[PDB]
Design a protein around this nucleic acid. Structure first.
Ligand SMILES: CC[C@H](O)[C@@H](C)[C@H]1O[C@@H]1C[C@@](C)(O)/C=C/C=C(\C)[C@H]1OC(=O)C[C@H](O)CC[C@@](C)(O)[C@@H](OC(=O)N2CCN(C3CCCCCC3)CC2)/C=C/[C@@H]1C
Ligand SMILES: [Zn+2]
Ligand SMILES: [Zn+2]
Ligand SMILES: [Zn+2]
Lengths: 209, 441, 85, 815, 66, 106
RNA sequence: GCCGGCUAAGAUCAAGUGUAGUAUCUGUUCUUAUCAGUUUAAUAUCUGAUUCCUCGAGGA
């Protein structure tokens, strides 16, 4: 309602305010990274989700200090925005949209890819779920490595290091391991394989199908 | 803020496709590559349906995919070159329904790099050597062997580096259990970086280079190198040994050339054009993919142009020498990234964008009235043909593919309660607007 | 004259002696060995078949890169055998 | 001038006793020089030096490489000398040194490639018909090498001609030997030419000469061994003659034919494999009674090969093969025969692997009680191999009783301490498991009698047995005379022999590790003060076992000894982190972790800081390692405040120790450090603003380890903040400081990303001063070699000038 | 120095820019979805875009100075 | 055959980034253009100094180390652990381009 | 450091001591000057040329 978000072909995001009574468009914030933006989506009054030509998704948020009423420090704008999320998808995203997919479910961020893929990014609501899924990802990175010789953490850090994303496509490969390795993985999380499978299915059915 | 990523619908675009006996039985399967997904398909010879058997996320970028088989074996392997600095060899396990990694060999740093190999992958037709190559100076060769338990052994790599060199394509050459050979389309740019006039940039030719691996002496040597008439795209292995001559087909702009080392002259055939074409007259014509079909009696090729026209290429031969190249118009299908000709008479078409197709090859041989072009025919001026609807092929199956998705909106535009996905996808005259709903039909 | 070989590494496994057993060949760390060391064919031949990659004594166990060197992809250079001229 | 070229080609001494750079320089120059020097002088001088009686291995390797390179260039000028070279290097192919053989084969291969096939054949043909058997072997091996170099079809006509020679049987013999050597040398690469070779050599099996038949059978066996598991259609014209011959021949030729049969059987189907086995089996059963021992070895090999196929089933084997096998081969005469002893053991194990363990095990277990101990050790070896490969499932009450009684009687009737009876006892008890309840009293009595006395070489073997069997000893719910054994092992703690003390400590540890500290007889407050003086022993096994025992005690029985003694023990263990051996260090780390977890971090940390303040270098480094261990076992939350309080001391050499400890702490804890980066940031700021060089070097090391420790965990804010303080040190001339700065920069390249590093390098890449340009291009090359691909998305836009186009237009496309 | 694409205190603008153009073209050839983007943008087959990039590999940024 | 400061200031889009030595570079136009990129912190400013990066003035004599507030408020159980992780605050941090130099502490 | 300066702001050339390494100390001198070349981001450095006053002496 109040602000304007601009996407540059090579710079990431510019924040502008329209002065209704002065008839002025003033730049009051920008970013510190070059991004080849393909699409953008507003998440709330301060946060923007962006996509890239090189296959990355990022979330950028204004610091709470941010002053809207303006009338460079890096040859740019005086105030900067912080990057709170970085993820390499592996395919070029051209659509981002916040929506609820199932009746009586929760809101997720649905993205779309140039290869015909569809995916979601969903938020965690508690620290326990986040910690459990983080440990699952850690243990599956070592005992179930990618098939063609790639490092999983290095692949999701292709252009920028990963920040605050858990790869649920690596995590659901637990259901396709052999029972011996499923037991070796599950007994480190202090759990049985059926409980891990149920916990994996719960977060998926909470948001998507 | 902490996020969890989930995939709802995997990618359906195909980059590479190979076929072979990957389960060890007599039926044939296809292995297709998505960007980061590997997938095994099996078309049913009774109904013509294509079923997906296995699909695995590899968490990388697949750049080259080959199949090979050792002498005396009944099972095909899979060689993958990716954006890692490793070459991998895989084996399908039908009883476990998974891909088992056989070998891993590390040779360089990760990423899609200029001089680290992984873009080009060639294999010896008898299965005793494999070559991995970058776009620049570095090339590596691995020798493949077998122990007494019939397991695959890999050797240490042999280097074939050559500075200031660009590679367009590499293929293995079919010799008769002689020393393995590899052919490369190469270009040297050293002279072009030293001439400020800009005349060394022009007047620079592609070469066709042959690399011979001497298994007795264990080294790779440059044997032959010849400059070409114009710049060509990919190469085609001609079946040799006791069934066919042993050379290469060079696909180029407006031409296709046969070449072999020795006393064999060069044979050129111009690519026919459509009669009363409506396209800009300044544009040339290239081939975009090819498919070989070898039979115990004869062989032929299937090449497709940018307009989507498949021609059937045969080779008129002598005891050892080739005398003519003959081209004949076969059919028109969408532009494909890969084509696989299957025994039991099926053609699989994986398009660059949109749905993929499986065709039944209905008419074997060629009993027809349409003209057959040749390299022996004199022309001052080019050949012309008339495109027509399908005559040699019948459509049996169609696999849906959302690639490329260009715009999406999630909304309840009908008066259900669940929202639908409205997807503007496709390119050219094959674009469409698709409505997606969660459920079964 | 402490220089690495830096030749194309083959299928031969690097070896460490009783004095260097826990060491990393590149950074000399002792924490978290992660990746098995490979050496070229001229470093693994004849009398050179089993030898410490750091010093050159009789090998007793496998040489490893540390997790820190593996993260930075320092295991992707050539043969890490210390050679003196 | 002639010696002109000689004096200048002393290049080979330039290489032989020379430096590696001039080695390769003279190599290249002599390669360029070879064609003009001429093969005459070059070989006239090199072949003597290669014939030198005391040349080295790698000198020989370099000489062979020189030969290879000077042979590649001069190709068709080597012909008039080929013969000569061969007489020098036709030996080295039957040499007992493997690498000598490899070098000779490489030399002959490069010689055959340099010359032609006709030349090699013309020089090698006169020695085909020689009478000296020493020449006909090197000739065949050299012909095999030439076939491997120039290809098999290039030699196929000469072969087809030479083994049809009606002139003499020596030529035919040598041709068939050439085929055999080709098979032996090339292996599974002969498969496309298998039928050609077989039809070339097949007519020799029916020759009038007996030496030709034998060599033909040996060549068939070699081809079949090279072909496995492929190729049976190519062996079809040999099945009739081979079996008719094994039916009619007798002796050496019979042995050759039987070897051929045995190598051919595993290639067939069930029908043919089953049908052919019956025939060769009646013949082999007849041949069981042979006095010759070579014949026995061949018969054993053929039995093992045929009994391992699918066409032969266990019924026919137990009905026809087992009675004569066990009646003729199992006598102590086989035991003193060292040649076929291992063959008999392997054949019997592989028989049991198909027919079933029970029958074999019975038939030989009745023989465990015997007057000869050689026959006892043989049976024990076979039994424990079968037990380890299959187990004791179908072993029943009678067989279990017999096994136990036999192994017990064999244990006591032992002259010299051997590993055979030890391993047999161990694996038998371990395979029986919870089934041996009363033989547990029996075995305990036996080991008590063996451990009581007799020279401590029986006592250390008894201690090894206890150490390897205590698990099944206690898991059968028995603990009392377990304590009776532990009491005696305790009394056997003062021993002059360290080897026996190691086994005693191992047995004691295996006991206390498997029985609970609960309800167990020998008190810990008695064992541990008796145990602490042994930690200063200098034997490796004693040290390792003592440290492991103290670690187990501290892990489970920590509440039985005062904390002061634990403090003394840990302060003594501090010195063992310098051990030259890896197992000592591993056990010391484990035990220190246990003691720290037991007595608490506070007091040990205070003592470790005091010790870090006052000692020499190595002890301070070990103290740093100990602080890192304490902080990892007890969360670094308990160590960091006390360590940061020590940086507050206004005195150098104390702050530097704190910085070294923080460096190693972060390097050691890795991923656990993500919760502690905010706490150490102001201290690193202070240390990076300091004038002292060691301060900044160590702070850079800390930054590097912290960066590589947290990666993918979202700690980029503090790392960018710290980079703002690390970067001004790039203009430092001191080598150690700049080395640490480069390490920290390459760690931040991973943790923070290459985009930030390129942003820091851009303005200096083209500075007017050459110093700035040198430094910045070094940093940029380090950033470029790692992650060259990511930089594609980060490069800044550069505008076109009048002459050149610099905009990348494809990235400006907008779909 | 042995790695192609590295620089030094005497590197010029032209060498830097042709190095980044050349590895940009190689990165386009490698990544499957960037080539898709370009082939949709300029309405060409992917084989044609690949061949055009390979042809541009030879002399990007024009011929050198003086 | 080299620019002057005022002459090069007339050619560039951003003249306030031009400095004394910038006219003495091998390619001043690229140097000034990279000095104007919308990022890319500048050089540490003491390359031309002659005092080895440590100023011997400004009275650096001061308190050794002031621990954070969370430092002050067995030795402490899991309850004081709870205290140390409830009291833990984020310290003052400088953003991407704020390089340190000898003077900027007072 | 003290209230612009009091020559502790730099370079250099010989010798001593000593370390695995960094180093530490003494004599010094410091062009007080100009031009040309080398060179340095610029200095620097190096390479060459260049009647008088006072009370037998000194300075320029
Ligand atoms: C500045 C430090 C010094 O350089 C010091 C390490 C060393 O230079 C001295 C010389 C000398 C001989 O006195 C000591 C050398 C080395 C040691 C004491 C190391 O221990 C050994 O050699 C034994 C062996 O190599 C393995 C020891 C081990 C497993 O504890 C090793 O550390 C590890 O592998 N860790 C520590 C980290 N830890 C965590 C736990 C979670 C998952 C695994 C990784 C992270 C896993 C186990 C290092 C220990 C000593 C420093
Ligand atoms: Zn390392
Ligand atoms: Zn060593
Ligand atoms: Zn090496």
């Amino acid at each position: 309602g109040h602000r304007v978000i601009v996407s540059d072909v090579q710079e990431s995001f510019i924040w502008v305010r329209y002065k209704r009574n002065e008839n002025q468009l003033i730049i009051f914030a920008d970013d510190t990274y070059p991004r080849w933006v393909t699409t953008a989506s507003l998440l709330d009054y301060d946060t923007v989700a962006g996509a890239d030509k090189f296959g990355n998704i990022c979330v950028v948020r204004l610091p709470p200090n941010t002053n809207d009423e303006v009338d460079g420090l890096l040859n740019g704008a005086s105030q900067k925005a912080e990057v709170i999320m970085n993820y390499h998808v592996g395919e070029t995203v051209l659509s981002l949209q916040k929506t609820t997919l199932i009746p009586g479910g929760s809101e997720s961020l649905v993205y779309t890819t140039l290869s015909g893929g569809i995916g979601i990014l969903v938020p965690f609501t508690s620290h326990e779920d986040h910690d459990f899924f983080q440990h699952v990802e850690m243990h599956l990175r070592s005992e179930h490595p990618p098939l063609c010789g790639r490092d999983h953490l290095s692949f999701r850090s292709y252009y920028f290091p990963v920040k605050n994303v858990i790869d649920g496509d690596l995590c659901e490969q637990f259901n396709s391991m052999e029972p011996n390795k499923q037991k070796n993985v599950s007994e480190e999380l202090d759990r049985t394989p059926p409980e891990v499978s149920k916990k994996l299915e719960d977060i998926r059915t909470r948001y998507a199908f | 803020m902490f996020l969890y990523n989930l995939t709802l619908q995997r990618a359906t675009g195909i980059s590479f496709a190979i076929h072979g006996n990957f389960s060890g039985t007599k039926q044939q399967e296809i292995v297709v590559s998505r960007g980061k997904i590997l997938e095994l398909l099996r078309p049913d010879p009774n109904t013509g349906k294509v079923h997906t058997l296995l699909t695995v996320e590899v968490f990388g970028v697949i750049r080259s995919l080959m199949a090979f088989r050792l002498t005396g074996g009944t099972k095909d392997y899979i060689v993958v070159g990716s954006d890692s600095g490793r070459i991998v060899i895989l084996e399908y396990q039908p009883s476990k329904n998974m891909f088992e990694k056989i070998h891993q060999e590390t040779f360089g740093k990760s990423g899609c790099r200029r001089i680290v190999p992984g873009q080009f992958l060639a294999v010896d037709p008898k299965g005793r050597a494999v070559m991995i190559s970058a776009i620049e100076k570095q090339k590596l060769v691995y020798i493949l062997n077998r122990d007494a338990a019939a397991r695959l052994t890999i050797s240490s790599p042999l280097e074939a580096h050559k500075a200031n060199t660009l590679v367009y394509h590499v293929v293995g050459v079919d010799v008769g259990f002689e020393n393995p050979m590899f052919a490369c389309l190469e270009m040297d740019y050293e002279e072009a970086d030293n001439d400020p006039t800009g005349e060394a940039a022009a007047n620079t030719q592609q070469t066709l280079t042959f690399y011979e691996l001497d298994l007795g002496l264990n080294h790779v040597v440059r044997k032959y190198s010849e400059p070409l008439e114009e710049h060509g795209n990919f190469l085609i292995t001609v079946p040799g040994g006791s069934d066919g001559p042993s050379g290469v087909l060079i696909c180029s702009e407006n031409y296709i050339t046969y070449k072999n080392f020795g006393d064999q002259p060069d044979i050129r055939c111009p690519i026919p054009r459509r009669r009363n074409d409506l396209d800009d007259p300044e544009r040339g014509m290239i081939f975009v993919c090819s498919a070989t079909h070898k039979t115990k009696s004869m062989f032929f090729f299937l090449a497709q142009t940018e307009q989507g026209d498949i021609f059937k290429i045969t080779l008129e031969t002598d005891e050892d020498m080739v005398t003519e190249i003959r081209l004949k118009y076969f059919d028109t299908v969408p532009v494909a990234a890969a084509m696989c000709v299957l025994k039991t008479g099926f053609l699989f078409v994986a398009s660059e964008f949109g749905n993929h197709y499986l065709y039944q090859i209905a008419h074997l041989g060629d009993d027809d009235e349409e003209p057959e072009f040749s390299s022996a025919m004199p022309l001052e001026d080019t050949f012309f043909f008339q495109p027509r609807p399908l005559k040699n092929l019948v459509l049996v199956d169609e696999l849906d593919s959302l690639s490329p998705i260009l715009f999406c909106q999630i909304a309840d535009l009908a008066n259900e309660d669940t929202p639908q996905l409205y997807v503007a996808c496709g390119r050219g005259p094959r674009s469409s607007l698709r409505v997606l709903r969660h459920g079964l039909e | 004259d402490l220089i690495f070989c830096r030749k194309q590494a083959g299928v031969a496994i690097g070896r460490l002696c009783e004095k260097c057993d826990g060491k990393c060949v590149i950074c000399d760390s002792y924490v978290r060995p992660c990746t098995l060391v490979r050496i070229c064919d001229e470093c693994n031949y004849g009398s050179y078949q089993g030898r410490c990659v750091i010093c050159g004594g009789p090998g007793v166990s496998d040489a490893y890169y540390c997790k820190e060197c593996t993260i930075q992809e320092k295991d992707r250079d050539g043969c890490p055998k210390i050679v003196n001229l | 001038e002639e010696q002109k070229e000689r004096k200048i080609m002393k290049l080979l001494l330039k290489i032989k006793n020379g430096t590696p750079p001039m080695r390769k320089a003279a190599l290249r120059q002599i390669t360029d020089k070879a064609r003009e020097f001429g093969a005459g002088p070059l070989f006239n001088q090199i072949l003597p030096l290669l014939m030198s009686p005391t040349l080295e291995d790698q000198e020989r390797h370099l000489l062979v490489k020189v030969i290879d390179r000077i042979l590649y260039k001069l190709d068709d000028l080597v012909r008039p000398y080929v013969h000569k070279i061969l007489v020098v290097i036709e030996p080295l192919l039957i040499d007992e040194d493997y690498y000598a053989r490899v070098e000779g084969r490489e030399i002959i291969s490069n010689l055959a490639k340099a010359a032609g096939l006709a030349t090699m054949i013309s020089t090698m043909r006169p020695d085909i018909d020689n009478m000296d058997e020493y020449v006909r072997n090197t000739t065949a091996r050299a012909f095999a090498v030439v076939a491997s170099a120039l290809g098999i079809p290039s030699l196929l006509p000469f072969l087809k001609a030479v083994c049809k020679s009606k002139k003499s049987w020596q030529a035919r013999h040598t041709g068939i030997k050439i085929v055999q050597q080709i098979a032996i040398l090339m292996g599974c690469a002969i498969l496309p030419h298998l039928r050609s070779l077989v039809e070339i050599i097949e007519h020799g099996l029916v020759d009038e000469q007996q030496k030709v038949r034998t060599i033909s059978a040996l060549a068939i066996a070699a081809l079949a061994e090279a072909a496995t598991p492929y190729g049976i259609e190519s062996f079809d014209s040999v099945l009739k003659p081979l079996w008719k011959g094994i039916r009619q021949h007798r002796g050496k030729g019979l042995a050759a034919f039987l070897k051929a049969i045995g190598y051919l059987i595993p290639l067939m189907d069930a029908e043919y494999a089953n049908y052919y086995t019956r025939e060769v089996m009646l013949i082999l059963i007849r041949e069981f009674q042979s006095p010759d021992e070579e014949m026995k070895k061949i018969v054993l090999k053929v039995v093992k090969q045929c009994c391992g196929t699918d066409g032969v089933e266990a019924n026919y084997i137990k009905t026809e093969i087992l009675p004569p096998f066990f009646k003729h081969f199992w006598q102590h005469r086989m035991a003193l025969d060292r040649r076929n002893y291992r063959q008999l053991v392997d054949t019997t194990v592989e028989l049991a692997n198909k027919v079933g363990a029970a029958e074999i095990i019975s038939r030989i277990v009745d023989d465990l009680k015997d007057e000869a101990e050689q026959y006892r050790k043989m049976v024990m070896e076979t039994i424990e191999k079968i037990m380890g490969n299959l187990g004791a499932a179908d072993i029943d009450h009678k067989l279990e009783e017999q096994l136990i009684d036999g192994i017990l009687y064999a244990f006591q009737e032992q002259t010299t301490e051997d590993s055979v009876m030890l391993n047999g006892f161990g694996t038998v008890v371990n395979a029986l498991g919870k089934r041996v309840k009363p033989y547990l009293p029996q075995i305990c009595g036996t080991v008590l009698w063996r451990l009581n006395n007799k020279s401590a070489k029986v006592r250390q073997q008894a201690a090894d047995l206890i150490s390897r069997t205590a698990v099944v000893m206690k898991t059968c719910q028995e603990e009392k005379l377990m304590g009776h054994l532990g009491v005696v092992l305790y009394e056997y703690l003062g021993e002059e022999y360290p080897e026996v003390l190691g086994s005693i400590l191992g047995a004691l540890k295996a006991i206390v590790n498997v029985i609970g500290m609960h309800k167990m007889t020998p008190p810990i407050k008695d064992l541990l003060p008796r145990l602490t003086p042994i930690l200063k022993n200098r034997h490796e096994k004693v040290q390792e076992n003592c440290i492991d025992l103290v670690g187990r005690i501290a892990d489970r029985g920590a509440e039985y000894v005062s904390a002061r003694e634990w403090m003394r023990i840990c302060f003594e263990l501090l010195e063992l982190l310098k051990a030259h051996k890896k197992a000592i260090r591993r056990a010391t780390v484990n035990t220190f972790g246990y003691i720290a977890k037991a007595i608490g971090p506070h007091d040990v940390l205070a003592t470790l800081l005091n010790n870090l303040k006052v000692q020499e270098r190595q002890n301070r480094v070990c103290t740093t390692v100990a602080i890192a261990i304490v902080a990892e076992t007890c969360s670094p939350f308990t160590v960091l405040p006390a360590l940061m309080n020590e940086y507050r001391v206004p005195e150098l050499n104390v702050q530097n120790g704190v910085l070294k400890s923080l460096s190693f702490l972060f390097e050691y804890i890795g991923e656990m450090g993500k919760d502690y980066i905010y706490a150490v940031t102001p201290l690193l700021e202070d240390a990076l603003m300091d004038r002292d060089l060691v301060h900044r070097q160590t702070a850079s090391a800390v930054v590097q380890h912290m960066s590589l420790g947290v990666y993918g965990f979202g700690c980029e804010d503090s790392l960018n903040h710290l980079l703002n303080y690390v970067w001004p040190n790039v203009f430092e001339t001191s080598p150690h400081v700049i080395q640490a700065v480069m390490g920290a920069l390459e760690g931040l390249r991973v943790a923070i990303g290459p985009c930030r590093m390129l942003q820091y390098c851009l303005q200096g890449l083209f500075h007017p001063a050459r110093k700035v340009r040198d430094v910045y291009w070094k940093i940029y090359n380090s950033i470029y070699i790692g992650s060259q691909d990511a930089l594609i998305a980060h490069y800044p836009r550069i505008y076109n000038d009048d002459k050149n186009t610099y905009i990348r237009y494809e990235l400006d496309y907008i779909l | 120095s042995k790695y192609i694409g590295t620089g030094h205190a005497d590197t010029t603008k032209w060498e830097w820019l042709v190095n980044q153009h050349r590895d940009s073209y190689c990165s386009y050839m490698g990544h499957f979805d960037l080539l898709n983007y370009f082939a949709i943008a300029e309405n060409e087959s992917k084989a044609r875009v690949r061949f055009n990039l390979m042809e541009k590999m030879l002399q990007p940024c024009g011929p050198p100075a003086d | 055959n080299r620019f002057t400061v005022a002459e090069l200031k007339q050619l560039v889009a951003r003249p306030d980034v031009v400095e004394m030595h910038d006219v003495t570079a091998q390619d001043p136009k690229l140097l000034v253009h990279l000095k104007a990129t919308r990022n890319s912190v500048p050089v540490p400013r003491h390359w031309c100094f002659k005092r080895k990066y440590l100023q011997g003035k400004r009275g650096i004599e001061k308190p050794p180390f002031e621990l954070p507030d969370f430092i002050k408020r067995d030795i402490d159980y899991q309850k004081l652990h709870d205290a140390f992780f409830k009291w833990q605050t984020k310290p003052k941090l400088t953003i991407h381009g704020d390089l340190y130099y000898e003077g900027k502490e007072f």
